[PDB]
Design a protein around this ligand. Structure first.
Ligand code: NA
Lengths: 90, 90
């Protein structure tokens, strides 16, 4: 099943408040990044991280991808409603 | 709004019947291709085409992409419920 969820986005080293972003569990990471950018600034240059003790970079295709490698969604990483994400540029 | 739809997949030059595949309008092309491959054979090596007079290759990122370029979904191309798609390899 596909369903909406909200993530809380921290813009790294900017000292600003976390920004809520409405995303879908079936959104690929690139779709998540586009929704974040649209919201925050109302994808190749930006990095998205999550800390479920060890910080993890979220990407469409990485070494964790379902294995031919299947595109990662928030559902793949098991990112749940309310999760904190970190956005950084360059 | 996000919603399901079924596409009818023709496996090019194999002389076989069209295969129905359940997809989502918010599925990127790579997500669509994965669902097609899972169904047909129960993404980089496969090509997906649609004929709304002129045949068009469907891809995550192409020259038609929303312009930084946003990832294509079936919703982007305006592929509706029942649409015929053509799958070819190499
Ligand atoms: Na999606």
């Amino acid at each position: 099943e596909y369903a909406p969820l909200t993530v809380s986005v921290i813009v790294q080293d900017e000292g600003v408040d976390a920004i809520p972003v409405k995303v879908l569990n079936c959104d690929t990471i690139s779709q998540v990044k586009e929704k974040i950018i649209d919201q925050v600034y109302r994808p190749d240059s930006v990095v998205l991280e999550w800390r479920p003790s060890t910080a993890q970079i979220l990407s469409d295709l990485d070494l964790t991808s379902q294995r031919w490698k299947r595109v990662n969604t928030l559902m793949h990483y098991n990112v749940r409603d309310g999760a904190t994400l970190i956005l950084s540029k360059v």
